[PDB]
Amino acid sequence: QSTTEEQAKTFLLKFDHDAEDLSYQSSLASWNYNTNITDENVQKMNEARAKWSAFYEEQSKAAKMFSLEEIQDLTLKRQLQALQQSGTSALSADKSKRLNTILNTMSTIYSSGKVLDPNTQECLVLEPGLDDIMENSQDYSRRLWAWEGWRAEVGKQLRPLYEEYVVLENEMARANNYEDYGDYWRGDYEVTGAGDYDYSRDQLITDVERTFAEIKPLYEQLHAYVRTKLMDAYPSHISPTGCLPAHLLGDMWGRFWTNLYPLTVPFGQKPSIDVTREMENQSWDTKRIFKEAEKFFVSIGLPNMTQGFWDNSMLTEPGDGRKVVCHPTAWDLGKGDFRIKMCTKVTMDDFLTAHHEMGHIQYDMAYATQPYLLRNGANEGFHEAVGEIMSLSAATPHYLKALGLLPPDFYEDSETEINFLLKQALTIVGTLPFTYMLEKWRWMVFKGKIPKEQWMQKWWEMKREIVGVVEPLPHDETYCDPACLFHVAEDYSFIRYYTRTIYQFQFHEALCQTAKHEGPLYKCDISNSTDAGQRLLQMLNLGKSEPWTLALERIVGAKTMDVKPLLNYFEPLLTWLKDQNGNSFVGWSTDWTPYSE
Amino acid sequence: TNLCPFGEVFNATRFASVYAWNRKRISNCVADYSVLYNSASFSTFKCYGVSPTKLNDLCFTNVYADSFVIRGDEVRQIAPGQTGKIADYNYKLPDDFTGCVIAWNSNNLDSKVGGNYNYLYRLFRKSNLKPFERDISTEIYQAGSTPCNGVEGFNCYFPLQSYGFQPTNGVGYQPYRVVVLSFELLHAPATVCGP
Numbered sequence A: 001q002s003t004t005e006e007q008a009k010t011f012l013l014k015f016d017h018d019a020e021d022l023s024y025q026s027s028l029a030s031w032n033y034n035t036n037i038t039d040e041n042v043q044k045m046n047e048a049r050a051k052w053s054a055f056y057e058e059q060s061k062a063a064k065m066f067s068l069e070e071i072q073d074l075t076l077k078r079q080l081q082a083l084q085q086s087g088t089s090a091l092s093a094d095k096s097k098r099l100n101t102i103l104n105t106m107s108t109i110y111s112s113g114k115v116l117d118p119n120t121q122e123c124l125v126l127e128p129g130l131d132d133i134m135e136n137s138q139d140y141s142r143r144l145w146a147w148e149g150w151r152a153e154v155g156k157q158l159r160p161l162y163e164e165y166v167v168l169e170n171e172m173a174r175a176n177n178y179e180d181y182g183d184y185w186r187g188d189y190e191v192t193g194a195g196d197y198d199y200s201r202d203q204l205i206t207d208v209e210r211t212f213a214e215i216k217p218l219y220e221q222l223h224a225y226v227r228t229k230l231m232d233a234y235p236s237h238i239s240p241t242g243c244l245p246a247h248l249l250g251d252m253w254g255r256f257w258t259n260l261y262p263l264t265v266p267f268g269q270k271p272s273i274d275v276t277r278e279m280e281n282q283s284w285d286t287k288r289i290f291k292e293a294e295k296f297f298v299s300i301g302l303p304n305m306t307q308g309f310w311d312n313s314m315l316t317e318p319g320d321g322r323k324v325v326c327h328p329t330a331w332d333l334g335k336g337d338f339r340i341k342m343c344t345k346v347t348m349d350d351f352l353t354a355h356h357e358m359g360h361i362q363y364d365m366a367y368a369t370q371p372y373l374l375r376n377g378a379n380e381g382f383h384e385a386v387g388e389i390m391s392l393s394a395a396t397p398h399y400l401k402a403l404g405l406l407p408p409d410f411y412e413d414s415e416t417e418i419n420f421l422l423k424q425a426l427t428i429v430g431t432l433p434f435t436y437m438l439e440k441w442r443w444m445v446f447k448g449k450i451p452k453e454q455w456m457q458k459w460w461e462m463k464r465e466i467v468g469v470v471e472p473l474p475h476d477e478t479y480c481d482p483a484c485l486f487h488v489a490e491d492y493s494f495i496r497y498y499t500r501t502i503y504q505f506q507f508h509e510a511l512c513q514t515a516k517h518e519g520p521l522y523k524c525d526i527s528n529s530t531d532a533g534q535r536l537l538q539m540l541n542l543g544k545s546e547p548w549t550l551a552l553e554r555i556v557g558a559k560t561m562d563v564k565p566l567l568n569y570f571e572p573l574l575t576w577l578k579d580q581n582g583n584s585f586v587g588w589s590t591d592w593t594p595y596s597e
Numbered sequence B: 001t002n003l004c005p006f007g008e009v010f011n012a013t014r015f016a017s018v019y020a021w022n023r024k025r026i027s028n029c030v031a032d033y034s035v036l037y038n039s040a041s042f043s044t045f046k047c048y049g050v051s052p053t054k055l056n057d058l059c060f061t062n063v064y065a066d067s068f069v070i071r072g073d074e075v076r077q078i079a080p081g082q083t084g085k086i087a088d089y090n091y092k093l094p095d096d097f098t099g100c101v102i103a104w105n106s107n108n109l110d111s112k113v114g115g116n117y118n119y120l121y122r123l124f125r126k127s128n129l130k131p132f133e134r135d136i137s138t139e140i141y142q143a144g145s146t147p148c149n150g151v152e153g154f155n156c157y158f159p160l161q162s163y164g165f166q167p168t169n170g171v172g173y174q175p176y177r178v179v180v181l182s183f184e185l186l187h188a189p190a191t192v193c194g195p
């Protein structure tokens, strides 16, 4: 005789042994397709993924026979709770088929979007014809027609599908005892029964709103400065106190304001730090780039890259006629196999992305000893916040000066530092309100608070209120503007990007305090500090085997999100932004619209 | 001079699985151990109860050579007192031990593109193995009260599970060949000697 706890351990022992091999075969099948685009490899990849999915589906039903109230062990309960979740299988078969065909129709319409230029000889798609218009242009009419055209083409067809998708996904969320689909999405940050290290699905909204409340004052100053600089480009189309039009935000959706840097650079007479010229003066090859990236992690106490990493990985574009996918990725194939795929070049940007990808690899090698079902990050935001702090350190002048890429007599001006902080602020600070607003709108749409007939009367109302962006042309309910984004159309949660930004700066501040660095945070370098690698490895080792609140406490010292380190990082830029905005009005009045007058 | 056939235990086409390992008795010969510890091929050469040097100066009555193939992370379980799956259910060593453990990587031979599933190990057993005991029974395991009567079902698992070896796996997941020499000493003319 045995307790349930001693039978659900045997079941998991069998499950690990089968699943490791099946998942490794699936990952090898996918790797052979990404590094060699052909026709046979697609079919092989499809077969492998289907086999793995079928096995996981059967084991999900198999795991439900053992109850969770009769299990005392925390790790066993976490492992079984990870496997017990079913997903869309709880619905009826016809409803599941309808959901699958609706999602496939949405993916097909988004990927095959077509817009017609007023010049009949030109037909443009989003990638890359429309994007080249959006990012690189300085006229008003072309951006206006492109911005309205893409929405007018895709939203009309995507709007009717979204309502059915919402009601069906809400039904599926009711199947698993979740209130709505938003709660199902917020269940990735929930910790239950741990004790003091607990977190509720309704607490995430409170923490997000509280954190955004502190961030708003800095964003208002940055918004006012960008508006004043936008005076000189479109004098007759922007109000001195109105919201910025949505089609002048640097890209298609306004997610990042990086493309506005050439227009809004503080001191345009000072060139940014670029070590590509001296990187080609020493005949640096790609393998040297990855070797210095490896040395950076060696110096702080983290382990060394495995031998198979050097042989199996595709560290450069092949020249034998093979066609590849050039998106930089770090692969954890399983069974101790770690690889990196990158069509790298001799440039500074690729030199930074090498450190980022190797940081992902280091996390994967760090949590490899945990049980199979606990080999992930603490939540969705941990894995992509570890990588960014490596690129933060790899770009500091102290790192390149000690690397030989800069002369020891190099003198850095405060003007260059202000330029660097402005370009950092356009990407990081400028994207937070958009992410928070979009995810709030989706949450309230799923919750049923917003009626179906009032979808575009609130979407813009929040956009003016939270983001300070006004529409250029009025839209009716026949439009579906949120569906014009890649992540919304393909059913992807968006709140991970908000929390990752907070976690990355908490991690940077803690690791810089460990190294006993003195001065502003944006100058911090953690190279040669073997004491910070131990603190990092205290958090990296746990994986998904301890609650994310305790994993956060192990490296920072607190078990909650905090934006104070983020404001600390941008303090020198804020002290310069207030002086510039001293003679300009801050804040946006919602009443003024370009279409009203 | 009749030298012991150490070249047919370390130098072999096919090795045995962990659950059913191969034992060879060596007696009535002279043993030149100098070839072994002076070879750089072996990655693990741990001698318990004796010294690797001066080993060929004592005479024993029998030597047993047990050979098998395991993973990289399971070589640490071939030692007196260690616990795991290999130690508990496949190959157990007594707490007192007079012998040596030799292990070397065999990725080039035992790993094939697509997997080499010819090596098995026992994953489930009612009780731990006694020292130097071999179990080759193939009966359905049972973790529930109700007997399943020879057909795999719910809570009834087959106890022997296969090994998946591929050339691209990590060092910890790559096959390793292990030979365990045990020198036994009884009252006898002490046939096995040194040079």
Ligand SMILES: *[C@@H]1O[C@H](CO)[C@@H](O)[C@H](O)[C@H]1NC(C)=O
Pocket: B006, B007, B010, B011, B035
């Ligand atoms: C196994 O073969 C190699 C190759 O000649 C040889 O050097 C080695 O001595 C052999 N092993 C033994 C135990 O003799």
Ligand SMILES: [Zn+2]
Pocket: A356, A357, A360, A384, A387
């Ligand atoms: Zn990344």
